[PDB]
Design an enzyme around this catalytic site. Sequence first.
Site, short mmCIF file in Angstrom:
data_model
loop_
_atom_site.label_atom_id
_atom_site.label_comp_id
_atom_site.label_asym_id
_atom_site.label_seq_id
_atom_site.Cartn_x
_atom_site.Cartn_y
_atom_site.Cartn_z
N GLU A 133 -44.59 -29.34 8.11
CA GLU A 133 -45.03 -27.98 8.38
C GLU A 133 -45.88 -27.99 9.63
O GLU A 133 -47.10 -28.12 9.56
CB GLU A 133 -45.82 -27.43 7.19
N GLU A 220 -39.08 -27.05 1.03
CA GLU A 220 -40.23 -26.85 0.16
C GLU A 220 -40.37 -25.38 -0.17
O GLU A 220 -40.31 -24.53 0.72
CB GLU A 220 -41.49 -27.31 0.86
#
Length: 296
Positions: A133, A220
């Site tokens: 991320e 995710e």
Amino acid sequence: SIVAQNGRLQVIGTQLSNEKGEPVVLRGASLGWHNLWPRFYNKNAVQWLADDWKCTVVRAAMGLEIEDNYRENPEFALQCITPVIESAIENGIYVIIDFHAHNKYTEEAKTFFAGMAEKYGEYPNVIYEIWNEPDYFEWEEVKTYSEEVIAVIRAIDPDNIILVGSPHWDQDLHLVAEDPIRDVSNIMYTMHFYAATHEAWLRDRTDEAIAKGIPVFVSECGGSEANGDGRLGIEEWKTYVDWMESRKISWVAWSVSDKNETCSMLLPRASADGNWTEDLLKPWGKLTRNSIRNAN
Ligand SMILES: [Mg+2]
């Protein structure tokens, strides 16, 4: 097993596909930051996720942030991910090797993925996720990192899937759409959502990117709020899962962990080795297990 049935994966246009070119949709669960919940990084937990939860994919989240991460302690990081990767091979399921970073760690990523590519690049089970991320970056800086890491991986492992993150926690697919990585095969771009926080815009943005030829893999996601806590948005979770299933988008639910947070699927009482009876599953655990089992 799913790996027996499908073998080496490949990306055709936008669609993740098997050896024979038929669409594949992977559904499974991510272990949390190895440096926070290392007890679940073992062979039995993975077999249990495969057998009882019907995970066709498992994600190994190798923490690059927070105390005891890969940079500070790479031996421990390698002690955690190795049984998870091996067990995914053993039990016939796909496995994401996730360089679980927010910040940019270009040289560490190259050295890590070169070693992972050398060890495991012939196994069809293995998917690489090169930057979990990215947060506060321009897409250009993340694309450069990605080109450079992909270049290293492809020299050793020419065919296995590489998942590519984008800024704002894999929400800036619209930036990817405008400036994609070129002359590269078998890559997809990640998207992360948390159903109680991220409203319809993110699905619309993702659809728009897919239309412009961007392959999308949800590496995710969860039903909780974006911080991993707060409300469990059960209806919103259903909306997202139904949307992904109609788009044949693969998804991985977060996290197989036992912190006192909505996104942690298990109670602390749960065994590291599995055999989680219904009472040991948190509400999000039950919802994840059921979601994965009914889809698979
Ligand atoms: Mg390969």
